From a paper:
Crystal structures of NAMPT in numerous ligand-bound forms have been reported. These structures consistently display a NAMPT homo-dimer with two essentially identical active sites at the dimer interface. Furthermore, we determine the crystal structures of six NAMPT mutants in the apo form and in complex with various inhibitors and present a definitive model to explain the differential effects of the mutations on various structural classes of NAMPT inhibitors.
Unlike the G217A/V mutations, the G217R mutation caused more drastic reduction in the inhibitory potency for all compounds on our test panel. The R217 side chain competes for space with the bound inhibitor (e.g., with the terminal phenyl-trifluoromethyl group of GNE-618) in a similar fashion as H191R. Besides introducing steric clashes, the R217 guanidinium group also creates a basic patch at the surrounding protein surface that favors polar groups over hydrophobic groups. We conclude that these additional structural changes render the G217R mutation more deleterious for NAMPT inhibitor binding across structural classes. In contrast, NCI-H520 cells harboring the G217R mutant are similarly resistant to all 3 NAMPT inhibitors.
Numbering used by the authors:
A (entry chain B): 8 to 42, 53 to 486
B (entry chain A): 8 to 43, 53 to 487
Amino acid sequence: EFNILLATDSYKVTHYKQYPPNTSKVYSYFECREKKYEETVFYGLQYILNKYLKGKVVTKEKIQEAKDVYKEHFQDDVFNEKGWNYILEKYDGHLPIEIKAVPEGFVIPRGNVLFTVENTDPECYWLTNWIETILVQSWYPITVATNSREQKKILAKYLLETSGNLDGLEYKLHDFGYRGVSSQETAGIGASAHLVNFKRTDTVAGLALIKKYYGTKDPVPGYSVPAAEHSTITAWGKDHEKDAFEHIVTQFSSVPVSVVSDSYDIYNACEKIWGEDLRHLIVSRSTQAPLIIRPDSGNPLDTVLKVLEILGKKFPVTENSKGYKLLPPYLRVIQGDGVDINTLQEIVEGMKQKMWSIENIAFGSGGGLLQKLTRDLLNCSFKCSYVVTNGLGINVFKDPVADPNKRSKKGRLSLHRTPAGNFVTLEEGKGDLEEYGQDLLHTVFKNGKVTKSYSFDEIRKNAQLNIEL
Amino acid sequence: EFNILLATDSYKVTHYKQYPPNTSKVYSYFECREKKKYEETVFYGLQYILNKYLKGKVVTKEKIQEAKDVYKEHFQDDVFNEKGWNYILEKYDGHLPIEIKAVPEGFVIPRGNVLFTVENTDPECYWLTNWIETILVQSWYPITVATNSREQKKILAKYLLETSGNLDGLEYKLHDFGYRGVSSQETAGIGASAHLVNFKRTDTVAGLALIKKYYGTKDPVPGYSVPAAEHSTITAWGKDHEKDAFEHIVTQFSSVPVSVVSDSYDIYNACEKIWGEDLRHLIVSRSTQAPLIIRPDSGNPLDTVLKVLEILGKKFPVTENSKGYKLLPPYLRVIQGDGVDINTLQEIVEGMKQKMWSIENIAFGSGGGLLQKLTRDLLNCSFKCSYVVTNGLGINVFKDPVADPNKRSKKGRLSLHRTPAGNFVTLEEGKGDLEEYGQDLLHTVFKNGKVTKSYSFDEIRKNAQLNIELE
């Protein structure tokens, strides 16, 4: 069972002894610090609040467990047993913490306050930063959602330019990341974050998380389609690749089906097997049930371009209203190898230069979508900005001489709309001067209760692209 | 509750309809594929997965119906092998009819070798071997963390040996700071445990419980920490009271090691004037078992470490050790815990050696670099089908993409052996059966729902030792 007393960085166990004597309040905030990625999608805090922070999170057993572990871990007795007991006895184990946050799905420029944390009981001054570690992990869903959305911007731009519209945009980036992430829990969180922007996923874990923690009007937030993997082709034997293809497309004759075509020779598969031997099984398919040819090796751009050129000569290609080449509607391509935001950009621009519509293509991304991301990408950071000691409030901050980029904000913070309709973060409690209207943060957690929440539908609406709006 | 029927890549739900008819066996294997450096990998983490997710009654009526309901909406189609899953439930009381054989955990194996294999034990369950690919492949993560951590240990060992003449304290020189920088609580536990294969310092507490539950140590705990400040415990005193914060903290922790972050405003002022003059009397009186550990946390990591040492070396009594390298007094040490990964670690210790500073003086903290900035393609961790039986005939299968020879996979039934020179070789096409290469190093670790062989965390550590530690 999860124990919040054991879910922090070890050194934080010793911090209650380090703050100034008679400190009654510790107030801290999270931002994606300013230094590509000029704006971030706020997503994921609600999951953390519900799964880990709400309700009775302290018991006698959990306190004893943490005491016993930390005694051995530090080779010394430094654990604040009394402080945790206070929370157990006074609040029935509910955390005396208040969290204010921007609404989930909101798209906010870097360097703005996204959420704040403060203790609601003076005895629990130490609790604010105890939970830094668990709250800071919000960096991951924020970062997946943001990087996913930046890829949606690229796709929308090139789809609009080559086809004249955005039809199918939300199906153009398919999460293949389940095997390439670091755990089952990460799989669910990361997939859910991708689904803020798109509707295609093979990472099943994301569905249950969304259903449990957020909710959608639709039965599921994300979809997949039948597809082969290398084993369902190669198992037929090296001389029987054609037999494999035929069986598979016949088994899935009236739904879309993706068939990995590079087990031995992608160019042969496209030109000779699909393009000649099995062509009669492709040209007979429904617009609602295309074959999706899937290359999976080689230089992604060169391979996509060559596959398209091959198919373009074996199948009837049309020219859309924008002047770009379009495969017949029973035939599409998916590139699911080596795709990240950079190579995605390179492929669509390369297609555009060769006059191929982005209609023709979809992308699968795994490690690039859900794993190859760190807290440094958006400088996701949690810092103390305000304390009260001896009944006096002090605005606090860091400002390292050798890195002004690491300077933190001072005092009590609030988020506001500017006269031009942008966001601004006011420091030093200046939000109280009421020169900038109401604070846009909302209380989302207070004294063990989740006080405000968002459906996955409203998160999606908040996260929409300008061009979509 | 966890449902194994919902723990695969979506497309795998459709694969039972795609294999050749009359297929009774699907046999697959995992390797860290060679790539035309990380030449050897630590095999670690499978036991966690076997116990947490694969063993026992993992199929129930309710889990089957749950999966059916989800996949109906997810695919907008009824494709789902309910009969296949029902069979496992009825015939095996929901235990997976799978055999997994694996190299012992902790083993250090060169790239391009079989590390584990997977096959179905019942012909009806040919589809199940690759169903569980997704969950098993996630073993890439503890493998890669353990491997990358160990490679950093090699660098530390080489430089510690060169600059000091021994390896004392080597296991305490890389401290896991990664808890907040990983993607989830579960990941934190797994990654932290992987680091602890090589080292003993961690703030990622989640790793301890995982190890205790799934592996076990003779010692009460596998990993340790020491009291340390963060910026909040310094800055809360106010900008003009950094010295008061330092004093309060070192006095609170006067008899144990304590790390104090010293760059809140001006790291160089802090070292030279605050530690080096104002509070010097509190530092020089400390025990060798309770040093002050000064922590810079910003600026160019190499440049800053060198300047911190230069400053401290002129405020404190420095000795020259038997190797000719400078050494701070035993009550004073430094930890660089910002921007550390395997590359910057190498650059720092090399820069230190150039400036004649012993590696004894320094320790490292690594967070994102240690537990998060790693992917499955770092070691090309990969799971492929190499053997099937169709119509009673075994056939050796593989992929071999024309444009990428590096993605070619192995053929047939596999086994891992010692070579005459003591190295490793993976035999293909069932050639291990010729018995020309002594015993298969793969052991059955899972069979029909039961974990059949387990390793303690102590055995794993012994297996993962550096050669230099052995010598």
